[PDB]
Amino acid sequence: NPELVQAVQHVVIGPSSLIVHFNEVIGRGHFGCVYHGTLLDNDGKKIHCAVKSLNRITDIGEVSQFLTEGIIMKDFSHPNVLSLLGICLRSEGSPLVVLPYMKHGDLRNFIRNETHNPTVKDLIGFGLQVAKGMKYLASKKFVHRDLAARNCMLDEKFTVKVADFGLARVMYDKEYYSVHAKLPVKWMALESLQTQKFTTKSDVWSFGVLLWELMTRGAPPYPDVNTFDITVYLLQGRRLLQPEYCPDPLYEVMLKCWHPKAEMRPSFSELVSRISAIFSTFIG
Numbered sequence: 032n033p034e035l036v037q038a039v040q041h042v043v044i045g046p047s048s049l050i051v052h053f054n055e056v057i058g059r060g061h062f063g064c065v066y067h068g069t070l071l072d073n074d075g076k077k078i079h080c081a082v083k084s085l086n087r088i089t090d091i092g093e094v095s096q097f098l099t100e101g102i103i104m105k106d107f108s109h110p111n112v113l114s115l116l117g118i119c120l121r122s123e124g125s126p127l128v129v130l131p132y133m134k135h136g137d138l139r140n141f142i143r144n145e146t147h148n149p150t151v152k153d154l155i156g157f158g159l160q161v162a163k164g165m166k167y168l169a170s171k172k173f174v175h176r177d178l179a180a181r182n183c184m185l186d187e188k189f190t191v192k193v194a195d196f197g198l199a200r201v202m203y204d205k206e207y208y209s210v211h212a213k214l215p216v217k218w219m220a221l222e223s224l225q226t227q228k229f230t231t232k233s234d235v236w237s238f239g240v241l242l243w244e245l246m247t248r249g250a251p252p253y254p255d256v257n258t259f260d261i262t263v264y265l266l267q268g269r270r271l272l273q274p275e276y277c278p279d280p281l282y283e284v285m286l287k288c289w290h291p292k293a294e295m296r297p298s299f300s301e302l303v304s305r306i307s308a309i310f311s312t313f314i315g
């Protein structure tokens with residue numbers, strides 16, 4: 032579609048400014064690989080970036096959706112949302128996503144690493160930052176669908192940036208199940224498991240699970256509940272139990288995130304207000 036080609040031009044980065052270090056692999060996933068990259072500005076200043084390949088994107092429909100997603104995400108400008116520097120649509124090679132490099136990697140690996148010692152307050156602070164980034168994304172009507180601690184990055188100042196190192200995004204929820212690479216079952220809202228649909232309210236459910244990952248320092252949720260038994264576990268009214276070091280008011284926030292009625296779950300704006308009040312009770 033020629034109009035889509037013209038609209039996406041401002042998102043495109045090419046060999047005139049980007050060098051992909053294809054032998055410097057940062058990470059490998061089902062979507063493809065993540066490589067170190069260097070972007071040069073007009074004064075020759077170097078910008079360290081991460082370059083994610085989206086191997087699934089090959090046919091004209093997928094490529095059009097990729098261009099649409101790049102236009103949408105190029106507009107992102109919020110301290111707790113990972114910016115999209117640009118995209119590369121090479122004549123030869125799979126499409127590439129150009130992101131700012133994140134010095135401290137993903138939030139899950141960070142809190143799980145035994146050499147790190149984040150306090151309960153630092154963990155609540157990371158949750159508050161994620162809630163702010165999700166309040167921004169929700170205001171843009173952007174439904175994440177894969178919010179989890181593994182998908183939130185930490186920059187050189189320990190600022191949390193909501194990001195996505197999962198499968199290439201789909202425009203429609205009906206394409207999501209087909210495209211999956213396991214579904215993030217243990218982060219999904221009850222209605223997404225049953226009806227295959229995703230909304231900002233199902234992102235709120237995932238945020239509650241992400242808060243649980245933070246308070247357990249990256250423990251796998253429902254380790255003892257098989258993926259195929261999660262839907263029934265949630266129907267029996269059962270939930271993730273309160274982590275040992277999770278304050279009661281923050282566990283109450285998690286319970287509201289997992290309300291069986293999506294319309295009754297708090298909004299991200301309410302979560303920012305509530306978690307800010309809880310965070311303010313911790314000294315340090």
Ligand SMILES: C#Cc1n[nH]c2c(-c3cn([C@@H](C)c4ccccc4)c(=O)[nH]c3=O)cc(F)cc12
Pocket residue numbers: 083085088096097098100101102104107112113114115117118128130175193194195196198199200201
């Ligand atoms: C089709 C398709 C795509 N699938 N994913 C894409 C991306 C991508 C974006 N971002 C950041 C801008 C982000 C994402 C979601 C929420 C907050 C911040 C990532 O972190 N990873 C990505 O792969 C960029 C893009 F131009 C196209 C696609």
